[model samples]
Target: MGLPGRVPLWVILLSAFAGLLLLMLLILALWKIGFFKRPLKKKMEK
Candidate 1:
């Protein structure tokens, strides 16, 4: 007899959820740091 191998559904779901959470955190940090602001305003002329 051969053993069957299978991945659990919960593990896949949890991994996807964690990936989304990390992505959201990254976006939030970038927004807080003004990463999407205009380039001209991002720098000050000396």
Candidate 2:
């Protein structure tokens, strides 16, 4: 049968927040570890 809403709205909201935090944590880790720091290609040539 075609069903209607099952899970609560708060549940979905919380799940979305959890996913956001997960991605945020990944970015924070990468940023702290210098993943976003890219030197210019010309510098490497020199």
Candidate 3:
């Protein structure tokens, strides 16, 4: 029920790329804001 208009290639492709970049930015910001957590050590470290 969305993006089913007369466009397909351009709309789908452009929206995908744009959304990808936006998502990346959001993730970056979230990481900086401490919204998520990560391991403090390496998996193979002693």
Candidate 4:
């Protein structure tokens, strides 16, 4: 569904900030669990 048309600027700003905070927290949690580690893969034969 589309967002309501008459939302206040403050509301938009607050929601954007909240979403950014949530994104940062998600990445932090992933880092804590070593999600950034590279997966091991065998080299392709020539």
Candidate 5:
């Protein structure tokens, strides 16, 4: 049996965008809670 190249490229691209949105939400939440935000978070971003 052979594999299927059945998936369309647009479908994968859509999922990637959705993931990026969620990732941004998580980071913004962290930024909102900015108590110990200097040493670790600053370095991690760079």
Candidate 6:
């Protein structure tokens, strides 16, 4: 069978970039909220 219809290049690139930016923002917010710090401190004490 022939390949399915493809998404436009720009659409794919824009979506990928947006996803990465969203992930980075989420990680920064989580770090600021101490989501990682508490676990890191506990691990370091071990």
Q: Which predicted model would earn the best TM-score? A: 4
What lDDT tens digits, residue by residue, belong to model 5 across residues 1-46?
A: 8658677787788988989899998988888776455555345554
Worst 10-residue lDDT window for candidate 5 reads 37-46
- Candidate 2 lDDT over 1-46, as tens digits, reads 8658688888888999989998899989888678557654545554
* lDDT of prediction 3: 0.80
Leading candidate by lDDT: 4
TM-score for all models, in order of appearance: 0.53, 0.52, 0.52, 0.54, 0.53, 0.51
Model 4 clash pairs are: none
Q: Give lDDT tens digits, candidate 4, residues 2-46.
A: 867877889888998989999999989888677547556848886
Candidate 1 local lDDT, 5-34, one digit each (tens): 767788778999989898999989888778
**Displacement of the residue 17 alpha carbon in candidate 4, Å:** 0.7
Per-model CA lDDT versus the true structure: 0.79, 0.80, 0.80, 0.82, 0.77, 0.80
Considering only N, C-alpha and C atoms within 3 Å, which residue pairs clash in candidate 6? Answer: none
State, as a TM-score between 0 and 1, how close model 6 is to the true structure. Answer: 0.51
| Model 1 stretches astray by more than 4 angstroms | 1-6, 35-46
User: Model 2: which residue pairs collide?
Assistant: none
Model 6 lDDT tens row, 9-30: 8888899898989999998898
Worst 10 residues of 1 by lDDT: 35-44
Q: Candidate 4: where are CA atoms >4 Å away?
A: 1-5, 35-46
List, residue by residue over 1-46, the lDDT tens digit for candidate 3. Answer: 6655676678888999999998999989889777446756657755
* Model 2 misplacement above 4 A: 1-5, 35-46
Q: Cα lDDT of model 1 overall?
A: 0.79
